Scaffold this active site. Structure first.
Site, PDB file in Angstrom:
ATOM      1  N   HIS A  52       0.845  -1.226   0.000  1.00 47.86           N
ATOM      2  CA  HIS A  52       0.000   0.000   0.000  1.00 47.86           C
ATOM      3  C   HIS A  52       0.869   1.260   0.000  1.00 47.86           C
ATOM      4  O   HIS A  52       0.737   2.099   0.896  1.00 47.86           O
ATOM      5  CB  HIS A  52      -1.000  -0.026   1.134  1.00 47.86           C
ATOM      6  CG  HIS A  52      -2.093  -1.006   0.897  1.00 47.86           C
ATOM      7  ND1 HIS A  52      -2.272  -2.109   1.700  1.00 47.86           N
ATOM      8  CD2 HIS A  52      -3.058  -1.053  -0.051  1.00 47.86           C
ATOM      9  CE1 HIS A  52      -3.314  -2.792   1.249  1.00 47.86           C
ATOM     10  NE2 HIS A  52      -3.790  -2.179   0.168  1.00 47.86           N
ATOM     11  N   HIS A  60       1.685   1.697  -5.710  1.00 50.63           N
ATOM     12  CA  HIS A  60       0.268   1.265  -5.791  1.00 50.63           C
ATOM     13  C   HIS A  60      -0.598   2.455  -6.219  1.00 50.63           C
ATOM     14  O   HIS A  60      -1.471   2.288  -7.125  1.00 50.63           O
ATOM     15  CB  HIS A  60      -0.175   0.672  -4.461  1.00 50.63           C
ATOM     16  CG  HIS A  60      -1.638   0.390  -4.401  1.00 50.63           C
ATOM     17  ND1 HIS A  60      -2.213  -0.622  -5.102  1.00 50.63           N
ATOM     18  CD2 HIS A  60      -2.637   0.978  -3.722  1.00 50.63           C
ATOM     19  CE1 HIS A  60      -3.497  -0.668  -4.845  1.00 50.63           C
ATOM     20  NE2 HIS A  60      -3.786   0.310  -4.027  1.00 50.63           N
ATOM     21  N   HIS A 120      -6.125   7.409  -3.010  1.00 48.93           N
ATOM     22  CA  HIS A 120      -7.127   6.447  -2.492  1.00 48.93           C
ATOM     23  C   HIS A 120      -6.571   5.696  -1.286  1.00 48.93           C
ATOM     24  O   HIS A 120      -7.403   5.147  -0.526  1.00 48.93           O
ATOM     25  CB  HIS A 120      -7.656   5.515  -3.591  1.00 48.93           C
ATOM     26  CG  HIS A 120      -6.853   4.278  -3.793  1.00 48.93           C
ATOM     27  ND1 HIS A 120      -5.712   4.272  -4.527  1.00 48.93           N
ATOM     28  CD2 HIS A 120      -7.028   3.016  -3.366  1.00 48.93           C
ATOM     29  CE1 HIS A 120      -5.202   3.048  -4.545  1.00 48.93           C
ATOM     30  NE2 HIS A 120      -5.977   2.264  -3.829  1.00 48.93           N
ATOM     31  N   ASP A 121      -5.257   5.629  -1.101  1.00 49.48           N
ATOM     32  CA  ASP A 121      -4.679   4.818   0.014  1.00 49.48           C
ATOM     33  C   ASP A 121      -3.724   5.682   0.854  1.00 49.48           C
ATOM     34  O   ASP A 121      -2.889   5.106   1.577  1.00 49.48           O
ATOM     35  CB  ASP A 121      -4.013   3.542  -0.512  1.00 49.48           C
ATOM     36  CG  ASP A 121      -4.904   2.306  -0.589  1.00 49.48           C
ATOM     37  OD1 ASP A 121      -5.719   2.092   0.342  1.00 49.48           O
ATOM     38  OD2 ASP A 121      -4.740   1.521  -1.562  1.00 49.48           O
ATOM     39  N   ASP A 179      -8.354  -0.726  -8.379  1.00 53.45           N
ATOM     40  CA  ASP A 179      -7.729  -1.128  -7.107  1.00 53.45           C
ATOM     41  C   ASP A 179      -7.221  -2.558  -7.181  1.00 53.45           C
ATOM     42  O   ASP A 179      -6.206  -2.820  -6.531  1.00 53.45           O
ATOM     43  CB  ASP A 179      -8.689  -1.052  -5.932  1.00 53.45           C
ATOM     44  CG  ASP A 179      -7.949  -0.841  -4.629  1.00 53.45           C
ATOM     45  OD1 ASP A 179      -6.743  -0.535  -4.661  1.00 53.45           O
ATOM     46  OD2 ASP A 179      -8.598  -0.940  -3.604  1.00 53.45           O
ATOM     47  N   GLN A 181      -5.743 -17.775  -3.959  1.00 49.40           N
ATOM     48  CA  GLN A 181      -5.784 -16.944  -5.189  1.00 49.40           C
ATOM     49  C   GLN A 181      -6.967 -17.409  -6.038  1.00 49.40           C
ATOM     50  O   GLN A 181      -7.771 -16.538  -6.459  1.00 49.40           O
ATOM     51  CB  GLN A 181      -4.435 -16.958  -5.911  1.00 49.40           C
ATOM     52  CG  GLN A 181      -3.409 -16.060  -5.231  1.00 49.40           C
ATOM     53  CD  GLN A 181      -3.822 -14.608  -5.285  1.00 49.40           C
ATOM     54  OE1 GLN A 181      -4.075 -14.061  -6.352  1.00 49.40           O
ATOM     55  NE2 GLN A 181      -3.907 -13.971  -4.134  1.00 49.40           N
TER      56      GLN A 181
HETATM   57  C1  LIG Z   1      -5.517  -8.105  -4.908  1.00 56.82           C
HETATM   58  C2  LIG Z   1      -5.502  -9.187  -3.942  1.00 56.82           C
HETATM   59  N1  LIG Z   1      -6.284  -9.043  -2.856  1.00 56.82           N
HETATM   60  C3  LIG Z   1      -6.311 -10.077  -1.997  1.00 56.82           C
HETATM   61  C4  LIG Z   1      -7.128  -9.953  -0.770  1.00 56.82           C
HETATM   62  C5  LIG Z   1      -5.540 -11.255  -2.203  1.00 56.82           C
HETATM   63  C6  LIG Z   1      -5.683 -12.326  -1.255  1.00 56.82           C
HETATM   64  C7  LIG Z   1      -6.154 -13.627  -1.822  1.00 56.82           C
HETATM   65  C8  LIG Z   1      -6.542 -14.623  -0.808  1.00 56.82           C
HETATM   66  N2  LIG Z   1      -5.571 -15.441  -0.358  1.00 56.82           N
HETATM   67  C9  LIG Z   1      -6.187 -16.236   0.614  1.00 56.82           C
HETATM   68  C10 LIG Z   1      -5.414 -17.203   1.283  1.00 56.82           C
HETATM   69  C11 LIG Z   1      -4.042 -17.264   1.031  1.00 56.82           C
HETATM   70  C12 LIG Z   1      -3.257 -18.200   1.679  1.00 56.82           C
HETATM   71  C13 LIG Z   1      -3.823 -19.066   2.594  1.00 56.82           C
HETATM   72  C14 LIG Z   1      -5.178 -18.997   2.826  1.00 56.82           C
HETATM   73  C15 LIG Z   1      -5.998 -18.060   2.193  1.00 56.82           C
HETATM   74  C16 LIG Z   1      -7.537 -15.909   0.789  1.00 56.82           C
HETATM   75  N3  LIG Z   1      -7.777 -14.859  -0.100  1.00 56.82           N
HETATM   76  C17 LIG Z   1      -9.012 -14.168  -0.213  1.00 56.82           C
HETATM   77  N4  LIG Z   1      -4.806 -11.424  -3.299  1.00 56.82           N
HETATM   78  C18 LIG Z   1      -4.782 -10.385  -4.194  1.00 56.82           C
HETATM   79  C19 LIG Z   1      -3.983 -10.505  -5.439  1.00 56.82           C
HETATM   80 MG   LIG Z   2      -7.325   0.883   0.447  1.00 61.99          MG
HETATM   81 ZN   LIG Z   3      -5.624   0.460  -2.974  1.00 62.19          ZN
END
Ligand SMILES: Cc1nc(C)c(CCc2nc(-c3ccccc3)cn2C)nc1C
Ligand SMILES: [Mg+2]
Ligand SMILES: [Zn+2]
Length: 313
Positions: free
Chosen positions: A68, A72, A106-107, A217, A269
């Site tokens: 962040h 970004h 935004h952040d 975003d 993912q």
């Molecule tokens: C933009 C962006 N935003 C988010 C939030 C993530 C997190 C993706 C996610 N990984 C998990 C996860 C990972 C490892 C172990 C267990 C669960 C659960 N979730 C929702 N990735 C990207 C690229």
């Molecule tokens: Mg934000």
């Molecule tokens: Zn952002």
């Protein structure tokens, strides 16, 4: 006045594409942003002295956190630039001005921690702003920077245009709270299918601008695979630091934030592309057809994460 910004030929070409990466040279990012404002908005939209001074005060108030950060800020502004340039006539002079600034701000002053972590830590910002905690802070920081002597890039707007642009920016920034995305997309989905979607309805434009802000975003998922994969390292580096801090408060973090459960990143993912990213760019493509390349890029990267699970990389 007659002073353009001009990028090298490769950047001049690739900056127009949705999947453009702004590169590792921090000192070019301000010029890249000014370039995008000039081509999107006009060389007249802002006083160059005041814009340059706003850009550098915004940069200063981003912190040195893995994801962040200032990079970004500019990346999310470039995605909005791409959406605006491919949808020329759908957006007012004011919206083009407001949304590129919205994306840059935004952040602002992000600390690397979720709203949930501010609440469980009992951070002062959680008492001041009970919902969309960081996002109300980001807009608050945007207003503060606009009010520094020499930094009001909107000075030459009427009283009412000024009020309209700060309101576009506020809604734009609040909508980057992913907690609000699900409801917003569901409503936009129902309106598109029943045929009631109307872009002259201000409350409808608000939801559409909201979805664009979620799309810009999340734009890390719409890059070429190597950018997507390396940006995921930065996203998880923050999440795992927050997991560490959750454990210090005596709270097991969700798996997403627990570095012990790195193994499960590929499946996480997959979930995220299926539950959040693909739906987001799908609904965006229906409302704004020229944004299809973001959906196409997102689908290609879903396929790349499928290959990771299958042990093919
Ligand atoms: C933009 C962006 N935003 C988010 C939030 C993530 C997190 C993706 C996610 N990984 C998990 C996860 C990972 C490892 C172990 C267990 C669960 C659960 N979730 C929702 N990735 C990207 C690229
Ligand atoms: Mg934000
Ligand atoms: Zn952002």
């Amino acid at each position: 006045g007659l002073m353009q910004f001009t990028l090298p030929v490769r950047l001049c070409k690739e900056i127009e594409l949705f999947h453009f990466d702004i590169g590792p040279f921090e000192n070019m990012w301000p010029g890249i942003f000014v370039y995008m404002v000039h081509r999107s908005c006009g060389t007249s939209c802002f006083e160059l002295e005041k814009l340059c001074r706003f850009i550098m005060s915004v940069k200063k108030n981003y912190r040195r956190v893995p994801y962040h950060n200032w990079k970004h800020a500019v990346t999310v502004a470039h995605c909005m630039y791409a959406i605006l340039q491919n949808n020329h006539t759908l957006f007012t002079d004011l919206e083009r001005k407001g949304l590129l600034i919205a994306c840059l701000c935004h952040d602002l002053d992000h600390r690397g921690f979720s709203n949930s972590y501010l609440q469980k830590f009992d951070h002062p910002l959680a008492a001041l702003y009970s919902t969309s905690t960081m996002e109300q802070h980001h807009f608050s920081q945007t207003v503060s920077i606009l009010q520094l002597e020499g930094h009001n890039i909107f000075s030459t707007l009427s009283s009412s245009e000024y009020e309209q642009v700060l309101e576009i920016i506020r809604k734009a920034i609040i909508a980057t709270d992913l907690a609000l995305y699900f409801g917003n997309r569901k409503q936009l989905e129902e309106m598109y299918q029943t045929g009631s979607l109307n872009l002259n309805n201000q409350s409808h434009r608000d939801r559409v601008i909201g979805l664009m802000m979620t799309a810009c975003d999340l734009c890390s998922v719409t890059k070429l695979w190597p950018v997507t994969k390396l940006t995921a390292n930065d996203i998880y580096a923050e999440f795992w630091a927050e997991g560490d801090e959750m454990k210090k408060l005596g709270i097991q973090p969700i798996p997403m934030m627990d570095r012990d459960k790195k193994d499960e990143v590929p499946q996480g993912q997959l979930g995220f592309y299926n539950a959040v990213a693909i739906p987001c760019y799908t609904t965006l493509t229906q409302i704004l057809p020229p944004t299809e390349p973001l959906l196409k890029a997102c689908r290609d990267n879903l396929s790349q994460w499928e290959k990771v699970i299958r042990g093919e990389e």
